[PDB]
Amino acid sequence: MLGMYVPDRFSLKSSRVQDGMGLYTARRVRKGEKFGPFAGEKRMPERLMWEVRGSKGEVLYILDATNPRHSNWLRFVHEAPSQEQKNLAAIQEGENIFYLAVEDIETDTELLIGYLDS
Numbered sequence: 001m002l003g004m005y006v007p008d009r010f011s012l013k014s015s016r017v018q019d020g021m022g023l024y025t026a027r028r029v030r031k032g033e034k035f036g037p038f039a040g041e042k043r044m045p046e047r048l049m050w051e052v053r054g055s056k057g058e059v060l061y062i063l064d065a066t067n068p069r070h071s072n073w074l075r076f077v078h079e080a081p082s083q084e085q086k087n088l089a090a091i092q093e094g095e096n097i098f099y100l101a102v103e104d105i106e107t108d109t110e111l112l113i114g115y116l117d118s
Helices: none
Strands: 010-014 021-025 041-043 049-053 059-064 088-093 096-101 112-114
Touching: 049 088
Parallel strands: 088 112
Antiparallel strands: 010 021, 041 059, 049 059, 088 096
């Protein structure tokens, strides 16, 4: 009875960086908007994963979105093949991972995560 939830400001359309679907905007994203937190299963050390680190840089745990039942729609955001295509960057605000829009994003554009650079 339940479909996986995708907010209505986004759409799944054919990805331009991988086979299958990717997450696209269905309306504009303004520079500075942030999305999340990223959801996943908390793993101890032993893509679809984010290390979560403490104030001092020590690894607290890994968030693993491999299982769709324990994650959310941020898992559909593919990695940017080259840093020029990136329009989201991962920020760890406290202990949560958020995806931050680092430029304005037009409607009908695939969201692609990468590193903040310069």
